Each structure stands twice: as structure tokens, then as C-alpha cells.
């Protein structure tokens, strides 16, 4: 409970980092697709 309360900012930060990385990867993949079309 208290341990979960202390670890919740870390879990939220990790999830935010994961979402940021995944969005960046999808963005880069679409850019590579545009490069291949070119």
C-alpha cells in the first residue's frame, strides 16, 4: 500500500517513457515508409 504509493510515480514515469518511445518508433516507421515510396 505505502510501498505502492511510493512506487506509483516510478510506474507512471516508466509508462510515460514507454509511450514516448513507442510513439517515436511509429513516427519513424511512417517516415521510412515515405522514404521507400520516394
Amino acid at each position: 500500500q505505502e510501498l505502492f504509493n511510493e512506487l506509483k510515480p516510478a510506474v507512471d514515469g516508466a509508462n510515460f517513457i514507454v509511450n514516448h518511445m513507442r510513439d517515436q518508433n511509429n513516427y519513424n516507421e511512417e517516415k521510412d515508409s515515405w522514404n521507400r515510396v520516394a
Binding site: V11, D12, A14, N15, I17, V18, M21, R22, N25
Partner: peptide
């Protein structure tokens, strides 16, 4: 605590990040 969805999502996300950089 591992069964919490947020913890599991963070765990698989760290695995995904490592696989991506590999």
C-alpha cells in the same frame, strides 16, 4: 503486485524498449 495492469504494462514496455534498441 505484478498482476497490477500498470506494473505489467511498464514491464513489457521495458522489454519492448530493449528489443527495439537491439
Amino acid at each position: 503486485l505484478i498482476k497490477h495492469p500498470e506494473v505489467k504494462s511498464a514491464i513489457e514496455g521495458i522489454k519492448y524498449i530493449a528489443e527495439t534498441m537491439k
